[PDB]
Design a protein around this nucleic acid. Sequence first.
DNA 1: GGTGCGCAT
DNA 2: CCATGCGCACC
Length: 1094
Amino acid sequence: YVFDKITDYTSSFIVHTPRKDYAPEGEKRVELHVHSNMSTMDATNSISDLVAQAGKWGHRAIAITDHGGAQAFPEAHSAGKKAGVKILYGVEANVVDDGVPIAYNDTYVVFAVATTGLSAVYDTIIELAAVKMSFDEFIDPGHPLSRTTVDLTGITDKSEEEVLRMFLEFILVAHNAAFDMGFLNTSYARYGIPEAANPVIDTLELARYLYPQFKRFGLGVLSKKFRAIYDAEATGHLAWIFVKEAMDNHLYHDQLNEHIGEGDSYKRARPFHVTILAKNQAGLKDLFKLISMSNVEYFERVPRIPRSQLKKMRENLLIGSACDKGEIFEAMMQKGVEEARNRAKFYDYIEVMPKAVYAPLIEQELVKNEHDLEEIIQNLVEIGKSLDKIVVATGNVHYLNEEDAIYRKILINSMGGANPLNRHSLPDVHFRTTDEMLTAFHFLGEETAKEIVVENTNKIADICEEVIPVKDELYTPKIPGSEDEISELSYTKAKQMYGDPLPEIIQKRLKKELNSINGNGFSVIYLIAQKLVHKSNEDGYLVGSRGSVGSSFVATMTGITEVNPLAPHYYCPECQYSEFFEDGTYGSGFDMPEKQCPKCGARLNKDGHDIPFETFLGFHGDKVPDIDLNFSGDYQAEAHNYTKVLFGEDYVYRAGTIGTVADKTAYGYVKGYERDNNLQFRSAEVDRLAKGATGVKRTTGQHPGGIIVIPDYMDVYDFTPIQYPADDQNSEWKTTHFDFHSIHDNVLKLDILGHDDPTVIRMLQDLSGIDPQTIPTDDPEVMRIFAGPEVLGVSQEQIYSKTGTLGIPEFGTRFVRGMLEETHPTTFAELLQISGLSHGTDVWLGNAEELIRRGDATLAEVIGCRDDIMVYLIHAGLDSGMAFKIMETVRKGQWNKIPDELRETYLSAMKENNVPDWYIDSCSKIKYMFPKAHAAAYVLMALRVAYFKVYFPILYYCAYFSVRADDFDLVSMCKGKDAVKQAMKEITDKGLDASVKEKNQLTVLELANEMLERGFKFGMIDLYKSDAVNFVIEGDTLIAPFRAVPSLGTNVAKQIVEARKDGLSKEDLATRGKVSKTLIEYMNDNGVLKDLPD
DNA sequence: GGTGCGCAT
DNA sequence: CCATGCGCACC
Ligand SMILES: O=c1[nH]c(NCc2ccc(Cl)c(Cl)c2)nc2ncn(CCN3CCOCC3)c12
Ligand SMILES: [Mg+2]
Ligand SMILES: [Mg+2]
Ligand SMILES: [Zn+2]
Ligand SMILES: [Zn+2]
Ligand SMILES: [Zn+2]
Ligand SMILES: [Zn+2]
């Protein structure tokens, strides 16, 4: 089979009828237990392909019940709508019995019963020890003791009726008193002896209640902290202590049960599997609430649902017994039919899987043979008919086909001893057809098998109505007076900048933008962005932007963005005079020559970059505005908390991401598996096995800057469950359970990202007092750096770079530096072009490097950004509608993918208007192109930083190292230029195959070399001068911070800062600061502690 | 802490 | 031969 590389499922080398459901059309099964790759490291198939398989097989419905989550619900909805298959939305929850009594039957005979296994039904007592606080006896099973028993219990090969009578004549006490009491009572009933229901105590539960701080409550562990005979004396020696603690720290038997299931009880309980299915939409909301609470309130190494919570919310939730790890199967195989018929009273349907699923039980000795397994399954079918419950065969599907099992194994093997499944062999939990299931349950008879496989499953499916896990429309928050507020802000700023009578250009722009925004109900997005940016500016932080927000003039006037999308123009700061150039004569208003106001003597401010708003709001303005804001890294938490304030702590959630097994991790898993199992896989197989195990959920994290806001007239459970990122209960924010991609079309996702540029600019403003917004972004001298390194005062030979853009965001990279060297930009428009080429896909390597090198087009003419295509075509003479459509087709790399007719219309229109041939050839090769407003914002930040680099070199270098540089040698740096150059040469001679740490070191070293070439120098740390994290400026020298010293750590860094304000001996330092000898050794050889006179 | 590695704009 | 940045897993 071609999987990329061809495979026969036996091995893979480097160069068919599918499974069918043979049952009749109306007699198809419904699979009610399906695990997708969203079950963390358990299942390997996407819910989409399972739903597609069910659709092909003719199944009317299928259930998606993952282990503790609903993260496959949106994909399942899409797949069920594509395949015409009804989806039942469920979960495989770990339920913990809320109240497990300590005393059962409301002088102590602490007893114990070594036995022949764990199933009171299917094995029996071999020893019956007890101490009245002594009665010890051996019982002989007819069968010879298995080597397991001979070892677990130190017993090698009177009648019970007699030993049982002796013990009956002799307050019962036991560790795991349920297990011993069940064994004793079954033995009693075996001879018609009275049940002997005297008061009982389970020392396990008493220890759990009295010492919750403990982690494991087994007898050995507990015995340490504080044969049947030994077991008994041990329990007795404890039980005395436990009862004394119960009487003192908290006096009767009954009172031993008063405080049960209260507190962290969920944390110590042992969970069991239950299946929860939503019966209707309200059931789905209740299921989301249950998942959210199991993730947020009752999480202990897994999401847990206390049984009391599942009881409250079960009017719309079908509860099923799940698998052999469910409590009904556990009771029937280990406690008896009466305990299973009492537990089954709580379920709504009973699940029985094929004997192939249960094989690991027979391998683990839990079930002795296939006969016992058949008996257990048959009893469960009968118990269900007796209590009038639906009995269904489920299958416990974990992957699609029988050949996919290996993938699961590999994943499981990757967990080592963490996964209990690694002890035994995995079952056959592929997706079985109706005929396969009928065959697997033929030992119950054809009628019963056909009932529990086909009829009952379809009855369960019919019980549930159609459910929609994902909404259809967008629900934005409501802020009263938002449209009016946005209009007022925009017009007030426009009047202040361009006088009360606004230029007709500005009038038209504002009117169209505001009609698109307020008309579509998008004003709340603008208002939230405005508030966030306004609060950021008050705190003294500039907010940059990513994407196309800068294309909006309402975004400029409301203060959200610094990019002015108007046509190039002058305006007078004093008298409000303005003059626009809509003729395409200038790329930007920044490139316009200096001019003085005709009306008065003040100079004219030049602005405008000719960015249409259609790129942001789409043609017709119906598109949802998307405003990604690069707030400072320091201020990002403040912006998140401000969203919390704006909308309330219960309606804002950090957007959640699901991290899966990618190629690197999957390859590592396969390699570890083949090492442990000592095989030799062929590279192609290994690659097939890695592919099969890829995409499986591995963890959950948070989105970098995404806050999801829920309308205050709804609740989060109408959209998604919630959780803590990575299941960290100490997290300050809750994330959405669903991946944000499935919900961001229905609720607002505020991208409040963090960028180092606003941090660097804030530091530069602090170090110089210059206001960041007063910096000239049209300065000619600052563009000389983009040309060559001479403006800096150094040569190409000394800074190893042709361009002086080292350390300039988005322009200091070797690729971009090479492009700058080959193009020599000299204007803001050309800088925006350089950006659209350094970042686009297929825009420079084979489309424009050549056109520029051969003179076909200049840098200013080639296609750099997506807005440029529309601007050029509209200037060429095409209709705005034609250019918009063509600009979209090109930016999406669909020039070739569009039909012949469309390509034809576009080509005809362009050629009819004198659009060159090289321009259409370029369009043909472009895969992705990014917006003009994005480039304008990033170029404005880069120019603001470069201004300081050129005119305030010491301040710029201090800010860069303090904010952007994290890994410093500091030894070559402190030595001088020669050592820095030697380190750079070492990293360079390490070649293309160099570590990420080495590349970061090379970047910092390049910056340090450039700073040294210019006359500034770095200095070793000073205990009474260096800062914790920031470089200090002293003269023309940069004093390195403590964090710069290799491994000085950051917490201990602040420590030495805290200590130095309190007040010798060189030992005092290590003592207070918590300096590790090793780092003191560093500060000593490098001269730092030399000062110390000790 | 440090280092991958996955994810996102 | 895209840049930058965040967050969790694992050592
Ligand atoms: O891949 C990306 N790289 C960058 N780089 C940042 C950048 C910085 C500066 C400029 Cl001027 C530009 Cl255009 C881009 N931003 C991005 N924002 C979104 N993306 C991903 C684009 N994806 C992938 C392709 O399909 C569209 C969605 C990216
Ligand atoms: Mg015992
Ligand atoms: Mg966004
Ligand atoms: Zn599972
Ligand atoms: Zn299960
Ligand atoms: Zn299962
Ligand atoms: Zn004027």
